[PDB]
Each structure stands twice: as structure tokens, then as C-alpha cells.
Amino acid sequence: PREIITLQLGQCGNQIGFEFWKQLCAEHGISPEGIVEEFATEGTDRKDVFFYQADDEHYIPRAVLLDLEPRVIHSILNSPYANLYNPENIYLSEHGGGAGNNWASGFSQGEKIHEDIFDIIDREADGSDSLEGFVLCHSIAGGTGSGLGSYLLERLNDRYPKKLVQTYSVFPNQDEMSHVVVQPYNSLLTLKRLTQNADCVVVLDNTALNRIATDRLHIQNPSFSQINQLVSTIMSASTTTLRYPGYMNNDLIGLIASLIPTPRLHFLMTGYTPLTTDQSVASVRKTTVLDVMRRLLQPKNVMVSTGRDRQTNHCYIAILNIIQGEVDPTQVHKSLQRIRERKLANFIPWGPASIQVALSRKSPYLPSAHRVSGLMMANHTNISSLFERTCRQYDKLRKREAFLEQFRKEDIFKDNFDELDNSREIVQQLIDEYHA
Amino acid sequence: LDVLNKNYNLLEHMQAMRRYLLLGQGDFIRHLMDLLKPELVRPATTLYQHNLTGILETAVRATNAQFDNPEILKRLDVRLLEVSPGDTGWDVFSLDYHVDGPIATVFTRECMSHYLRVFNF
Amino acid sequence: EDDIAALVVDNGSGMCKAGFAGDDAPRAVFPSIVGRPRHQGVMVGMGQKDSYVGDEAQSKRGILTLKYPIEHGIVTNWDDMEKIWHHTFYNELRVAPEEHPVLLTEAPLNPKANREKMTQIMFETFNTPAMYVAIQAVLSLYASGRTTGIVMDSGDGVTHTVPIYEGYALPHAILRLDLAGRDLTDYLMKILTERGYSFTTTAEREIVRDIKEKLCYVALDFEQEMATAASSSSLEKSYELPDGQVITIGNERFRCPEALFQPSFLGMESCGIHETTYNSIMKCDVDIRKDLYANTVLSGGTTMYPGIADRMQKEITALAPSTMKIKIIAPPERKYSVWIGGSILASLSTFQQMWISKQEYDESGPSIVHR
């Protein structure tokens, strides 16, 4: 019916998808090894849209996880949520990889394991006779998720041409350049494949993570154990129309169709306010829906590093405001009434704009059926500031003679560096041209 | 009001018809309308009905594992018009909520005749 | 009136028995259960509801969550005990308890603070004009004739041994024994697997409680009945069911009433039913002990067996002295024998100055239950 195959790949893409499947059992009322609660069918009306359909009421995840590093998968099998995963769909015990840290490693390893990489991931494709598409849950940081992920964006474009492609990709961190220095090279090589060899992306910045991780979360030493908490909730938040029973844009080709203006303009800004557990003691007094979307357009919950004074000459075109759970829908048109009076979104002068709001009932659970949740999927034309940030860090590195002799020994014979530079400037010029 | 709750589930069928003629839950109708399009693109014939009951019944089992318990699948059917076979084939298909006994006390002839009209739009 | 215009509520040890007075059979009996669906969503098969109680909760058990207000024969929670009282008054009978005086029961050994709790519930929420707190022990004895003698409470819950002398019970003789009918149905389950027959749902485990009172019989002299079973007599019965499970009995025909006198089959060192009968009479006054042996009355759901009157007679004579005239008075019905005693007490010639009304509750609080 609407079966999606997630493509978890890389050192960071496997960990953000590990707790994504772990989030799904707590809201479906199911255990990874059994069914102890009856809340799975009376409370939740649809479960076989991301999981594989049941053979013994055991909803297998439709997931594949490949990585060159064996460290990310050795921290999985000792956890009690790995018995839900199957040891025959992806790998058996003692799976390995390369050495290995290179963008050209996984780019060259795709055609030497070409027979095996297109054998076991295609067995899940013909399980349903109407496949939705493929989401590449991969990474941009490092050479593991960026090297091999650029290969599958090409060969799955023609072997599966009538399928939706759209990824939840995480952006790397640009604070210092000591541990990694190959960061401007492997990022722009995948970013070219994300626009012409891929339809849509969902950007997730790393410098904006610790802006939120010290905002309300109150940590002193930033660890990697907090990167899975902001990411796994908004992943399950994006499929609330798709997993839980909704009516309009209840498919993944429903939501993405109403937000993309044009190809190579698909970078969607994400926002999510409620992350604090001591808000729970004051949501008993009928906290309404009239105050939760006034702060979405206000740049506080954003996960995109952008300029603060660059929003006057940029214009919103498509903005999504997803409320979940208890909505009190007699005032949801009242919340959309107050949008035109502030004009917090700059509107495009050539065409109409749209503020789309939708709702779906959440899990039968006490932290879910009590507190209001707001998921934002914006589309603003100030996203070229990240593309100006990455390009200015790209041409400055090529004048310092950095990784021009250390990178072209394997499988690179011609200069494909300006092939990425002009196509990035094509994106940056067509964005500002789009508001005439 | 308590004899319907023990035997007939009268006002439960009030919520139930909203899922099909008013299209409350979309997964019942999207997995329908996906499977229903390869038949609606051709003009309708005499042999149009016997496949539509089979495409209704395999659409309600891909989306359900507990809906066999109530008495709703026997009180909903496929309604089709008397239109000549030289049409596009899209406007002939509709679903209707059937009534037999005490559910026909609360549902007379004027109710579903208006529900055909709200269905077509 | 109160011959017909008074309600007899017999809150038993697992079943609530409501009905108007003057009858010899209760109106509506069902097991006392409540059910809470912890969240909402869609409700299929039955109506959209935030709380299924009573008979709409017995059809959905793996769909609902189960809760017993009466465990060990004593009320453990007072919110769901009132919810069944709301269910019996307004849904299964549909009469307002604001003009009709209400006759409700209690345990013989419950504290006074519990007895003050149930007076506060009936006056405020249901607004009864008058009521009376009566023990279940005195109602079954009044249905057996005069109000002197000892009753053998063995229901679904905890066995009570209450000796009553002419309407007044003894304070320091109410012995509490943990032998229950729910222990015997669990005892029948752990010897049915030895036959090879098991369960897969809770519904197959429910009919064992029906077979405990239907198929199993009491034989006089259990001791030769196992000796004739050792010589392979005809005592094995196999009951047939609509589904594929075939529940048979072997030597468990006579053993579940034998577990009353022999608690070693239950796996405990506790006293038998005839022993806690004998231990209760052995601390009474010595002149009224003769009046207790000749008025032994059986009551409850565990005691529902044919041929149990002469078995209790032959078992008590080995401990009691042989000069006492002992008679086991076994009524034909005994689950409902408490209810018929509450209705014949309701049709008494004089009950009008024994009413606990709204006026005395406003003037002395709930301490007027001391009487």
C-alpha cells in the first residue's frame, strides 16, 4: 500500500535511525519482542506503513543499515531493542567494512559490492505491489555516509524511476577544522547529488543543535548522546498524518507535493517547540492552540543557521504548521485567523502563499494525550546563507593547496571541483530570481 | 437508548457512516481509490460490478485486522447508476450505507438519497 | 411500603444481587466487575464509552482492563463499589433510590470505619430515605427459621464461621480462614494439565468455575471413593464442549470438596472446614454449644453441591461429643439464601423504628450505625 523503505547509512545515520525505530514501539503500544498491550489496534488504527506487515503480530522494521565502521552496530545487539531487528535482512553477526575514512572509499566500494548491495535490499521491494519510495537516512559528516550515499542516489534513480525520493539528512558541524579537514570536499559532492539526483531533502544543521541543546536542556559538556533526542521525535512527528489515521496529505507524496516550488529548491526549514518535561504541570488548565503557532514563525525553534537581518528581502512561499494530539479543533481556524494580521511571513510578490495546518490524534499515552505539540516544515528563501557559508569555505580551501594532491590518487582524474561550484551558484541565483 | 447499545449499535453507525460517505478516515478510501483507478479509466460495462465487489473486499483487509468484529461491512455496499456504457467510467462508482431492520428506523428513504449527493462532490 | 417498595441489595463475595423485596429469587445477578479503557480513540463492537461497567464489561476483557472491588470478601476500594451500585440501581433495574428504603449487606468482621464509609455513600449520592446495615450471616440463619445457630459461609471469597445466638452474634469467635472457592478452581486447573488438557485463553479458564459446581459431586465417604477409584470404578466423566477442548474429570470429581476438609491438596497446613467449624464452637459458652450443633446452616457458592448435608454431618461427629444432637440444615438454594433472608426481614411486621434515616444522620453523623 504505502510502504516506505528507510535507507539508514553511515556513522551518524545509523544512530539517528536506531532510536527512530525505538520511538515507534513506545507509541504503538508494542514491545520489540512481544505484544503485551492491547492498545495497538483500538488506539492506533494503522501500523503497517513503516513496519513490515505482520506474520505473528511481529511488526518487522523495513530497515537496512550499512556502514564501514563496525562500532555503531556493536552498540546495538546488547540493547534489548535489537531482537526486533532481523539478522538476515541486512547482515548476520560479525559484519565489517573498510579501514576507513575517505569520500572516495565508499564511492569506489559501491561497484565492487554491486552484486550484494542490490540483492537483499530489493527483496523488501516486491513485498508490496505499490511501493511508496525510498528515504535515505544518511549523513553528510564524515566520509562514510557521504561516500557511499552518493552512489545510491544515481543507480536508484533509473532502476526505480516512479518512486519518491526525499531524505532526512544531517548537516555537519563547522566550529573548528582540526579533527576533520575534508569537510568542505565530501559535503559539496553529496550536495550536488541532493538537488539533481534527488527530489527533496530535510536539512538538519549541527551548529543549530547545540544552540537548542543549551537553550532549555541545560548541559555543560556537549556529548553525542543528545543528538538522537531532537532528531527522533521530529522524524515520527513528520509521519503523524501517515502513521496515525489522517485524511489530507496522509502520504509522504502528499506533504512534499504541497511545499516544493520547483526542483533544486527543496530545502525545508524545521521547527519544534515542546521539549521540556516541567511544562506538564500547567497543561492541565486547557492550554489552547491559539498560542502555539505564534512562536513557530518567530525564529526561536529553528534548526537552520541563517542571518537575522536577511529576512526582509526574502519571502516565505510555503509554510507547514502541524498540530498533534489534543487540538481543540473549534479554535484551529481561530489560530489561522491571527496569521494575516501580523504578517510574520513575508509573502512572495509574484504569486500566492499558503499556511497549511493539519491535525492527527497521537498515541494513547499520558505524555502524548496531554501536551500540545507543534511541528513546523517551513520553506524560506534565506537558505542560501548556508550555501554562501559552504561555498566561501570551499573556494578558500582550494587556494591554500589543501587536499589537491592527497585526494586525486584514487578514481579521480579530472577536476570536478568547479562542476560543484557552478551548480551550487545555480541554486543560489535561482532562489533570488524566484521572487520577481 | 439502551436496547440499541446492547444489540444494534445505532449511534455507533452514526460515527461509522462518516468514515465512508463523509470520508473521515482517509486510509480506507486512499487504498480504495488507488486500486479503483485501473477500473475507472475504462468505460463501464455489464461486467463492471463483479470486480468492484472484489476490489472493495481486498481493500478493506489490507487496512484492517480488527474491523471484522462489528456489523458494518454487511451494512455498506457499492451503489451504481443506470448511466449508459458510453461514459468515462469515473462517475458510476459510489458507496452506500445499507440498512435492514432497526437501523432503518433511524434511517428512512430521504437520508441516503441526500448522501449520494454529498458523496459525488 | 417496604414489602415490595424496599430494595434488597445483597453485596456478596464476588456477585451483586439486587432486587425488590417480597420475592424468593433475586432480580439481577452478575459478577461484580468494573472496567476502565485508559484512553480513547475508536471503539468497535460496542458503544463509544469512557467506562464499561457490569454486563458491557464482561463481553470485553482482553479489550478492557479488569478490576475487582471485592477481594477476599472485603471491599478494597470504595470508588468502584459505588460504581456497581450506580449500575444496579439505574441500569439493570432503573428505579430511583430516593423514595425506596435500601437494604444492603456487609461482612461480619469489617471495621466500623468501613461501616461508616458505606453509610456516607448511600445518603449523599443516592439520597435514600432510610436504610439498615445487616450482616450476611443473620439473613441466611433467618431464612432457615429462628435466629439461633451457626452458619457456614463459604462463598467465592473468604470463609466466615459466625455463630449467632438469637439474633446476636459472638464477638470473639468470628474465625477467618483463607479457604476460598477461587482456590479450588485454581486447584482444579493444576490437576487438569496432568490429564493433558490445557488452556489458551481466559474464556476456557472461566468455564472451570462452572464445571466446579455442575459436574463435580460430593460422595459420602470420600475415603472409600478414592479407594474404589484405586480399584478402577466408574467415576471418570468427560464433558463435551462446542470447541475442540475436551475437559474431563478423573479422581477430581470428589477431590475439590475434599480439599475443604483436607487443605493439604491446596498446599497449606491450615485447618479444614469442619475444624474451623469446631474451633468456633469450642470457645462459646458451654450451654449454648448444643444450640449451635443442631442448627448448622450451609451458605455460599463453594457449598453448592448435591449430597453435602450428610457429608458435613459425618465429618463433624468425629470431633464433637457423641451425646450432642447434630443436624446439618442444608437449604436447596444457598447462594441466594442470604437474599431471601433480607427480603423476609424486609417484610417484618415491625421494622419502622429500626430505620437509619436522613434525620438521625443529620443529628449524629454516621455514628448512628452503632445502634
Curated annotation (Swiss-Prot), chain A:
GO biological process, one term: mitotic sister chromatid segregation
Location of the protein in the cell: Cytoplasm, Cytoskeleton, Microtubule organizing center, Centrosome; Cytoplasm, Cytoskeleton, Spindle
Main subcellular localisation: cytoplasm
Residue numbers binding GTP: 141-147
Chain segments annotated as transmembrane: none
Key word Cytoplasm present: yes
Family, per entry: Belongs to the tubulin family.
Protein name: Tubulin gamma-1 chain
Protein's organism: Xenopus laevis (African clawed frog)
From Swiss-Prot, chain B:
Subcellular location: Cytoplasm, Cytoskeleton, Microtubule organizing center, Centrosome
Coiled coil residues, start to end: none
Function description: Necessary for the recruitment of gamma-tubulin to the centrosome and for the formation of a functional centrosome.
Family: Belongs to the TUBGCP family.
Subunit structure: Interacts with gamma-tubulin.
Protein name as it appears in the record: Gamma-tubulin complex component 3 homolog
Native species: Xenopus laevis
Curated annotation (Swiss-Prot), chain C:
UniProt keyword Acetylation, yes or no: yes
Places the protein is found: Cytoplasm, Cytoskeleton; Nucleus
Enzyme Commission number(s): 3.6.4.-
Chief localisation class: cytoplasm
Molecular function via GO: ATP binding; hydrolase activity
Coiled coil: none
Entry-linked SUPFAM superfamilies: Actin-like ATPase domain
Residues carrying Methionine (R)-sulfoxide: 43, 46
Name by which UniProt lists this protein: Actin, cytoplasmic 1
Species whose genome carries this gene: Xenopus laevis
Lineage, uppermost ranks: Eukaryota, Metazoa, Chordata, Craniata, Vertebrata
